[PDB]
Fold Nicking enzyme.
Amino acid sequence: KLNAFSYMNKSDSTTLKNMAKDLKIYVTPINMYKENERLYDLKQKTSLITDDEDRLNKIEDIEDRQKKLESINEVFEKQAGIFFDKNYPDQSLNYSDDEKIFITRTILNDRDVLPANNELEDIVKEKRIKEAQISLNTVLGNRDISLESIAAASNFFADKLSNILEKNNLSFDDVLENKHEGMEDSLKIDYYTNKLEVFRNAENILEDYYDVQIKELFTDDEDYKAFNEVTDIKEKQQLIDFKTYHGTENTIEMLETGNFIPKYSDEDRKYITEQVKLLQEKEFKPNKNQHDKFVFGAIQKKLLSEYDFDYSDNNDLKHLYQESNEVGDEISKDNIEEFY
Ligand SMILES: [Ca+2]
């Protein structure tokens, strides 16, 4: 069949090799997508350094790499174009250059045979999911990718702004009128301001990243389109959260059947609630013993292993309550009310 270097000149073949050498990375459409985000985020921190010597050299140290990512991209674009005319000519106008490149590269190194019109639609779904993950995980850092996390992230910087502005007695309109141009904090003021946008963007990415997932939850392609028009982003998150608690299979049946389903048995449900009470009860025991620390962890470990209950998550607990209320498990429902 075909291999990675199909439709690729030897001049291009050599470029990829040379580049990966100085770039010190394994060249892949996604890996390039990653570095680009990493480098974008980098250029912004550069501005702050202060030592004009560093910022000057550092800024060019990046401009060089970005120039490399591109000349690597030009190579991929050529290979993809050829690849499509040769193999998927009727579909060549149905996808974007980036999309094509991704598909082209995946077929060569990660596929036996060829997708085939219909199958070529699915592979793009893969990139759409991969790309979002990488972006959100990068900017959030140790925040778990979630609407609540994104909010928490921008608020951290919103606060950083309000405070730095008060420090200089500058207003929101002042910074809009560029009153801060010649201050020491200016660069910081702009940095924060930009970070706010960074997370406005993340919020959009997330919505797309969800949309693609939620599409797989609806069997009725039409029923989906309808649901999509009435719901906002917050409502969409509640579904994702709801999905990760009941798993995909169940969740799918739930919204098309319209009937509720319990993740746990009545017995198990009772057990879990009781344990939750044990942890909270032993969560404020002053000067905890080594055992008290072990028992605390021993219970969590069991809960998660045996039942699939993530006390840390706190989403499992939220939907547990929802479950109890729905089936009318007063016992458990009551235990959870005592907890909250
Ligand atoms: Ca879970």
About this structure: The radius of gyration is 26 Å. The chain has 14 helices and no strands. Residues 244, 308, 310, 316 surround calcium ion (CB under 6 Å). Residues 165 and 171 are 6 Å apart (CA to CA).
